[PDB]
Amino acid sequence: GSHSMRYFHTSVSRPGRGEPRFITVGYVDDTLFVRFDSDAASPREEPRAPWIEQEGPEYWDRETQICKAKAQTDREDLRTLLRYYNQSEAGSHTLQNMYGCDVGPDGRLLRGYHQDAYDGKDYIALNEDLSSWTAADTAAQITQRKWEAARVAEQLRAYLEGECVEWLRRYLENGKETLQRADPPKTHVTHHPISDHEATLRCWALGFYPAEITLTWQRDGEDQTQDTELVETRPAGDRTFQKWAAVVVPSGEEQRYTCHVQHEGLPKPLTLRWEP
């Protein structure tokens, strides 16, 4: 199937409490594989998946150097953005950045990403063409002008089309035991009385990977979109994910209800019913 690699970065200033905190993580698909935290005692890029541990010390030294450099540029940028937005040095502010690539089954680039936010709002993003920018406001237009002058987009495109794809391919092969295995959901339907006249039907999906999943309730073949409580897909803590969908049903009409489960680890989409 298709796959992705992403790096996420967050810098958060804390006036009066030292330099900004910097945290960056790397993922392949829904699997965390590297992290760096500026507040660690001896901050280094660290492995978080077994298949990356085999990379040699040259790899780890270089990835550490890149993270530390990003921490520094972010510190500088937080100061710059105070100027761009006419803000005081008193408050905490946040810079976020994500970049990476999606590849298809054949391993070719499907799409590249590089986008930034300040204080939780879009700041500047590389467009899908990997050659132009979208700036959210007049401050971000200053950055856009700088990055156009430094030919940032051309270098980013080179990375996204080159190393990003190539190393994603490398990781997928080295980690094929896990990265290329889908774990289907373990499913069940539970019944929870509310009152005389109604009860909750809850459809469970447990232990699945990757996170992408569709859980829907139907009443006599009709989608109960408006009346379904759907919790956010949540991590179990052991690579896998969990989710549930619930409907409130008039007691007696339970059999008019079926839960449907779609997951890439499922050959046929599943159909579940409540059973006492």
Binding site: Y7, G26, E63, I66, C67, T73, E76, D77, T80, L81, Y99, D116, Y123, I124, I142, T143, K146, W147, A150, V152, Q155, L156, Y159, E163, C164, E166, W167, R170
Partner: peptide, 10 residues
């Protein structure tokens, strides 16, 4: 594998 670029500032 992270992207390397030099003194990229906003």
């Amino acid at each position: 594998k992270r992207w390397i670029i030099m003194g990229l500032n906003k």
